[PDB]
Design a protein around this ligand. Structure first.
Ligand SMILES: [Ca+2]
Ligand SMILES: [Ca+2]
Ligand SMILES: [Ca+2]
Ligand SMILES: [Ca+2]
Lengths: 20, 147
């Protein structure tokens, strides 16, 4: 899951920075 | 769930996708480039406002410790659906509801990941749980919401 996890974490990071 | 070495290593890999010049900090420029690769076009103010909300040392950039705190934190109300949906649309450029190997490779190259054919194929295989050769929206969600 390495490449999917990185991409997901990038999307997660953007979502959290926006919300926070 | 508790913070693990394996998670810290995943978080560092994600930080590195933003820190494109490899200088140890994420600037407004770097954040915006990744957001545009993932289907958004943030304003200059949205970028500075996102960074300031995780920059206690006030240098106007995100360092790894602040990124790590952000990604590890127990956090609830998030617009994760919106973000995942827009990301799905940038992969699925022809709008047919399925992400192909070609579409996947296009976006991974834009994120800075020059995947080999073996890697592209393995990415599709991991996500393609229904076995039809292509990644639908539900399959995409499973890969993007993995903890
Ligand atoms: Ca940097
Ligand atoms: Ca900082
Ligand atoms: Ca498609
Ligand atoms: Ca499928």
């Amino acid at each position: 899951r390495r490449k999917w996890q990185k991409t997901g974490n990038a999307v997660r990071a953007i979502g959290r920075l926006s919300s926070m | 769930d508790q913070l693990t070495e394996e998670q810290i290593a995943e978080f560092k890999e994600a930080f590195s996708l933003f820190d494109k010049d490899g200088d140890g900090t994420i600037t407004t420029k770097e954040l915006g480039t990744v957001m545009r690769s993932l289907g958004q076009n943030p304003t200059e103010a949205e970028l500075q406002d996102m960074i300031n909300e995780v920059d206690a040392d006030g240098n106007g950039t995100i360092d790894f410790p602040a990124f790590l705190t952000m990604m590890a934190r127990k956090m609830k109300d998030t617009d994760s659906e919106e973000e995942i949906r827009e990301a799905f649309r940038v992969f699925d450029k022809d709008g047919n509801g399925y992400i192909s190997a070609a579409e996947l490779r296009h976006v991974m190259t834009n994120l800075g990941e020059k995947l080999t054919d073996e890697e592209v194929d393995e990415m599709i295989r991991e996500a393609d749980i229904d076995g039809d050769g292509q990644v639908n929206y539900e399959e995409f969600v499973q890969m993007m919401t993995a903890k």
